[PDB]
Amino acid sequence: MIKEFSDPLYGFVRVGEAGLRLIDSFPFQRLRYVKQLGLAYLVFPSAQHTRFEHSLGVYHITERICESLKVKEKELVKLAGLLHDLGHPPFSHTTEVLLPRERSHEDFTERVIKETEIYEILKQDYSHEDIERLVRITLGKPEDEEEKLLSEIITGEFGSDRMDYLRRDAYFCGVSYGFFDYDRLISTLRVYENKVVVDESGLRALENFLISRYFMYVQVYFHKVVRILSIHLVEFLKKLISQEDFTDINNFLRLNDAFVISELFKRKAFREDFERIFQRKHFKTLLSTENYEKFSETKERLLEKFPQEKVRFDEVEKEVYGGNIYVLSSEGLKKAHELSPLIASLKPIKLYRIYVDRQLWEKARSELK
Amino acid sequence: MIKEFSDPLYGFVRVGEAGLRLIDSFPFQRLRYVKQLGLAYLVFPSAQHTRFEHSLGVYHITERICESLKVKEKELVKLAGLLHDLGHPPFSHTTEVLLPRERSHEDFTERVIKETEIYEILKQDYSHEDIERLVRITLGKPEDEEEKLLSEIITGEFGSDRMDYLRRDAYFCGVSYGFFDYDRLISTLRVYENKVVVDESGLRALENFLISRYFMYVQVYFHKVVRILSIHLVEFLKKLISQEDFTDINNFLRLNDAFVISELFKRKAFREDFERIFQRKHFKTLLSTENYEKFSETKERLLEKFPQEKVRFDEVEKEVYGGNIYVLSSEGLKKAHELSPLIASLKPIKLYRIYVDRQLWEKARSELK
Amino acid sequence: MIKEFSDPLYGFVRVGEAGLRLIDSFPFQRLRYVKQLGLAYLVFPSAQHTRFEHSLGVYHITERICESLKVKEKELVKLAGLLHDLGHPPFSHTTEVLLPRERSHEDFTERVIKETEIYEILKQDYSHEDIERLVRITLGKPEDEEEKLLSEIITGEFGSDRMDYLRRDAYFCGVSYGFFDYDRLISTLRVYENKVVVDESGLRALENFLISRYFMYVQVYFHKVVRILSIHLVEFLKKLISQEDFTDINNFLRLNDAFVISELFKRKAFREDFERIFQRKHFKTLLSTENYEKFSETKERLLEKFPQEKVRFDEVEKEVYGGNIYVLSSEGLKKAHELSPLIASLKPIKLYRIYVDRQLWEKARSELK
Amino acid sequence: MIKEFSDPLYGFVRVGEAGLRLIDSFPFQRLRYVKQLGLAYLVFPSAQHTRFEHSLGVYHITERICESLKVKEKELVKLAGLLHDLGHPPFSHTTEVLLPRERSHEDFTERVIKETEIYEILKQDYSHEDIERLVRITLGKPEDEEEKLLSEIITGEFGSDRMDYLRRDAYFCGVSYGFFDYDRLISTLRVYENKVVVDESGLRALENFLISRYFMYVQVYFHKVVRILSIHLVEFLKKLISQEDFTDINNFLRLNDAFVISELFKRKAFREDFERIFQRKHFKTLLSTENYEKFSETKERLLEKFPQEKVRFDEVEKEVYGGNIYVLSSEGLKKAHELSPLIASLKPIKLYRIYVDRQLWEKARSELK
Numbered sequence A, B, C, D: 001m002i003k004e005f006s007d008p009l010y011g012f013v014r015v016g017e018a019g020l021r022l023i024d025s026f027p028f029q030r031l032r033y034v035k036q037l038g039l040a041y042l043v044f045p046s047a048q049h050t051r052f053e054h055s056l057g058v059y060h061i062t063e064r065i066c067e068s069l070k071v072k073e074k075e076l077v078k079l080a081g082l083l084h085d086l087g088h089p090p091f092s093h094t095t096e097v098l099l100p101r102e103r104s105h106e107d108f109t110e111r112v113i114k115e116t117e118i119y120e121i122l123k124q125d126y127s128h129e130d131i132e133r134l135v136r137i138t139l140g141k142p143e144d145e146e147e148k149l150l151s152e153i154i155t156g157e158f159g160s161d162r163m164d165y166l167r168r169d170a171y172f173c174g175v176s177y178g179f180f181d182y183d184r185l186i187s188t189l190r191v192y193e194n195k196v197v198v199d200e201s202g203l204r205a206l207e208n209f210l211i212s213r214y215f216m217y218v219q220v221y222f223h224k225v226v227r228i229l230s231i232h233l234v235e236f237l238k239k240l241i242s243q244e245d246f247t248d249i250n251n252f253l254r255l256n257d258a259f260v261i262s263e264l265f266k267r268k269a270f271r272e273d274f275e276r277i278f279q280r281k282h283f284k285t286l287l288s289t290e291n292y293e294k295f296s297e298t299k300e301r302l303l304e305k306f307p308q309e310k311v312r313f314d315e316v317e318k319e320v321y322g323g324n325i326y327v328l329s330s331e332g333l334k335k336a337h338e339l340s341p342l343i344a345s346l347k348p349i350k351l352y353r354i355y356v357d358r359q360l361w362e363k364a365r366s367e368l369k
């Protein structure tokens, strides 16, 4: 009826019968073989956590938020959270790689829910219409204001998805700045005018959350080496799937880290990809800057001199505060930046990197600056 | 010879023989009877830590920083850290009330070191000249470059004094928002051009340190009730020291928290002081705002209707980053804001408060809206 | 209506209107001036926490346990927990000192509840009969099986009193072994046959709790120096109160740490007490042993040779597991030691100490072993 | 020259050039593909940590212990710590299945060090003789007293190997019951009479270490489902290595977790193995008891009615304290139980389990009661 799972992020996650049935299905079990952070373990060696544990964590936090917000459709929203990652391919930024292969561009999460045993499991407790609702909610495609609130609980600025992965990524990578008082923040959330908002008692908790998110992006998600390994990985994965066909969902489901890593370790047609990823031959950071003009002028000089195939450019950006968070004050709604100098200080992260083939690095360095 | 003291911040603090002799003296033991945060325990109940434990913590953090920086004169700077608080008067913001009531203005820390057994104790290990250098170092008044480096270790922006109190204040108040473990920050410190600077590998640790400091200010030091209690206390302390004579250092040494409180709890002349501070009859916050114009305008309308005696004003304007921290880059020494857009962007804290006698509070409220 | 208090042990403690009224009374405020651990700060310098914060913590944990156990009289039990320490005198083991003074030997907690403004505050919400019930519950003097369950929630083996002070004492003294997963233990508690019992899912949590309790006793409560300072303190306090009269409860209420410490610091008739406690002249540990026979034979030799006034003996004992804890298993109640080798291993702590005047220590050492 | 690796257990692990050259070799990188705890992640989902991170942690803890103990041959013992796992075969309890399938029985750790690039790498820094000493030290087979001391640092009861895995296993499994920070224990270690011993000031830290180890055994290593999964895995692994030839070391090196799992997930011969391990069809626990007689009697009645193939038995009998740890007292060297009644009293863990095919489980249950 209820089973407990140890999770070092929370203590224990209690899961009821519907979640357990889903957990034991083949598509959910597959997530144990998909690292949350892809190749990041090559930089942060303890980053071994998988999408399976993250999905359990999302279910847990979704439950907590639904409890705090007194949401009526609690069980349906918890399952939406649990199943949020079913269609995630192995690695980072590789949904954009898979989608253009299949003719429909149908989201893989929607497909795994509707085309596998997951669909049958859900029907035990829900109508097909409620299942369509859970698909909209989990994919962030609400059709009305009711679904919008429920979807925000998982995918919003305070969503259970983000709350779990920020803390889980911090815990495994070893980044103490990524922790925030999730418990206190959840307790200060309110529904107001069909929005999830923060009570003014939660203003420090909100600051801490936004700042923790800043640290995770600068330290881990935008780490210069994590990014170039991902660049090499995606170029490889583009080749591997180039003639693969996803009309059969089982060709998606057979995609896990090990499958891709094995093709890389064994086929000699991919030796170059293999070296760039696994033998420390990734292109080397020539420039990392917050100054777009400096980046652009260096990029231009390099491309005048070096062939394009020997360089890579990466422009990364993330709003730390997107201007759309309300704080419920004594005098009604206000925007968080009106009340917080810290939130008021927050600007988008903008980082520009140039990487070069290890053979040309010295030449590119001296003949360019 | 070497004794260990339990300290929940650090595990144990190990102290050598010179430090123990100093710890055992009466002017150091006095610090056990002066709360680090004065009356803050009336708002944050667990803020019971004293200047005694803080001083042991400063000694321990000074040791650590000297170890990281490979400082020659380690023992002397450790002792300068240890004795840094000898001249502190009970509660907060009290130095400025005692100095005018003393003819020459001499710093009480220097007086306690020179006019009590502390001097004889230090003379066992240090020359007359090194004791004068210890005094300058501890007061932040160096006369040369060696003294300036050593003084920076204790009193600088991330000096051992601040590193200990920010962490200890958070630990005892219960402030779960900052990350307060500066082991990483300490490890990335360097001496360059005779300054304590941060290596670029410590940029994130420096960001975390400045954010943790912002949280302590907004949550604790500038808490609106903490501030009004201190306003009441300081008014009283001035009456109590109308014209006390500090020519005899023992009249300073007898000032501890219990002495001040007893003088209050007992005398019928000081009854309204007692009520405002200890019977929860402090002036009530009418306005707390970040807008100087709203403050100025409310102050005007208010002083039209009510007498000055029945109101108190408080202006807090505090820099979260002072523009004077160096980071050692591969390109040489930079200002921290030159390398961290986030630090470059941290805004100052600006808060304006108006407090009114609790009897007139409802009267003042509706008469202003 | 609800006020939040920061407590580093829990985050925030939320207190309703009845608790707030009680908190702001003179007898509850007095507890801010009574250190939980008495003179232990002379050994563990950060042990500055007071009975005021402990009482708030007891209220908080009582609420949590009542919630987990679905107790009907939740509010009355929470207040019983909040008011549990009202009659605690300053220091350790000094209730046994005060009781024989007053003619009635009435418990001081009962007296403070019934003879001060506390009584009037409680009547706002409860009948005098319910107030008598709260007195029985808080003092562990239940009159029937209903009251017995409620009283166990506060004063039992898993009581909220113990759960708070073990963790609070660990947090402030700096003893990491004294922490246990209080949250998990509370969640596995059950009421069965009018007893608080532990579900079998909580068996590890129970082991951890009992072991944490072991560490606190060996490291802190029975620390050899903590004990001899308490021995000197109690002998002093016996003198101070010898002719004091407690028929007026205000003579109890004026007893706080500062009052006693001041009599000690200022009256020269007590110079010897003062030195033994505050000038490092406490009797020195000559023998500390688990072997009663070795203790007894050494005690006899010393008393043949030295006058009794120059030695002190201390026999300390504590059951770590008292054989009276039930675990609700699949096949009904069992005793914890049937299921746990760790609990099965636990024997009473038995420690025997001899202390001697610092003048006779060397003579006692050589002329005795 | 010196590189830093994030490790959530320690902050960062700093490695010098000899260690980096070893870390970058293929036999060391293999360890990234072998989970520390085998199949435990099927019960404790976050148990994803690998032998790679564990080996870096052993290197780091070895460094720390050499620093505390002032060990001359620090670099050599650190490298012995680093390479300790080179010969580990994927999953748990697998050494004993590989050794009989290899003619001479030579330890695979020694083979990997001598028969791969590891040897050439070590020869850059160490003589032929020091490499033979490193091998003995790491295998716990010393030939003299220096080698024995160094080997104790890694493989002893509180060796760096155990200190790291107990803490790392707790951190990733989520075991909140022990205290697993052994900084204090390390600081109290001494070398006496050429043994690693504990100073009496570390008696409590030693008690905590042994209790923390008890918790890991009862909660994780002896978890009834963890044990049955390993029983199924080991039966399969034996079939897979019926007669594989390990004369070529590359046939050992190609054994990682994914290789074993692939061999299973794919071949139709191994289908019931696959189901028992990966499709939650493991034999179900019929009996778990501490009573050998109940075990023996249930085993008998059971084997009367059901065939051997449909049942599995497991006997676990593990010493929580082995009687062979020394504590340096003021009276000289003692056994730990001579000084700690609690350690003297810790009982062994004894657990007997009977598991049955999940089809026959209800049939076996009521036929036995």
Ligand SMILES: Nc1nc2c(ncn2[C@@H]2O[C@H](COP(=O)(O)OP(=O)(O)O)[C@@H](O)[C@H]2O)c(=O)[nH]1
Binding pocket: A041, A042, A043, A044, A045, A225, A280, D003, D004, D005, D006, D020, D023, D024
């Ligand atoms: N060399 C090496 N570094 C690793 C490994 N795993 C994690 N790391 C860390 O991640 C970083 C990888 O960057 P690297 O490829 O060496 O390029 P770098 O930025 O010039 O040092 C290193 O600095 C290490 O701190 C590993 O297996 N080998």
Ligand SMILES: Nc1nc2c(ncn2[C@@H]2O[C@H](COP(=O)(O)OP(=O)(O)O)[C@@H](O)[C@H]2O)c(=O)[nH]1
Binding pocket: B041, B042, B043, B044, B045, B225, B280, B284, C003, C004, C005, C006, C023, C024
């Ligand atoms: N009333 C009261 N509040 C306390 C006490 N100790 C700490 N606090 C905390 O102090 C804060 C504000 O106190 P209060 O005097 O009631 O000011 P106000 O509520 O802002 O008008 C609240 O967070 C209380 O939780 C106490 O003894 N009495």
Ligand SMILES: Nc1nc2c(ncn2[C@@H]2O[C@H](COP(=O)(O)OP(=O)(O)O)[C@@H](O)[C@H]2O)c(=O)[nH]1
Binding pocket: B003, B004, B005, B006, B020, B023, B024, C041, C042, C043, C044, C045, C225, C280
């Ligand atoms: N000397 C000294 N020790 C203190 C003080 N506060 C805490 N301690 C600690 O508590 C212990 C007190 O014991 P002490 O009176 O010195 O007798 P000891 O057991 O022989 O060291 C010391 O070992 C210190 O670790 C203090 O003010 N002075």
Ligand SMILES: Nc1nc2c(ncn2[C@@H]2O[C@H](COP(=O)(O)OP(=O)(O)O)[C@@H](O)[C@H]2O)c(=O)[nH]1
Binding pocket: A003, A004, A005, A006, A023, A024, D041, D042, D043, D044, D045, D225, D280, D284
């Ligand atoms: N059913 C199931 N349990 C899991 C899984 N991963 C971890 N667990 C935990 O594994 C434990 C026991 O698993 P199970 O196979 O159901 O054995 P049983 O419940 O004791 O018969 C429970 O604590 C689960 O919470 C999973 O994928 N499926």
Ligand SMILES: [Br-]
Binding pocket: A015, A016, A017, A018, A019, A020
């Ligand atoms: Br569920």
Ligand SMILES: [Br-]
Binding pocket: C015, C016, C017, C018, C019, C020
């Ligand atoms: Br209440």
Ligand SMILES: [Cl-]
Binding pocket: A010
């Ligand atoms: Cl939680």
Ligand SMILES: [Cl-]
Binding pocket: A037, A038, A039, A040, A091, A092, A229, A230, A233
């Ligand atoms: Cl990736």
Ligand SMILES: [Cl-]
Binding pocket: A162, A213
């Ligand atoms: Cl995010």
Ligand SMILES: [Cl-]
Binding pocket: B015, B016, B017, B018, B019, B020
């Ligand atoms: Cl010293």
Ligand SMILES: [Cl-]
Binding pocket: B037, B038, B039, B040, B091, B092, B229, B230, B233
């Ligand atoms: Cl103050």
Ligand SMILES: [Cl-]
Binding pocket: C010
């Ligand atoms: Cl809590």
Ligand SMILES: [Cl-]
Binding pocket: C037, C038, C039, C040, C091, C092, C229, C230, C233
């Ligand atoms: Cl005491």
Ligand SMILES: [Cl-]
Binding pocket: C162, C213
């Ligand atoms: Cl107790």
Ligand SMILES: [Cl-]
Binding pocket: D015, D016, D017, D018, D019, D020
């Ligand atoms: Cl090295």
Ligand SMILES: [Cl-]
Binding pocket: D037, D038, D039, D040, D091, D092, D229, D230, D233
């Ligand atoms: Cl295994």
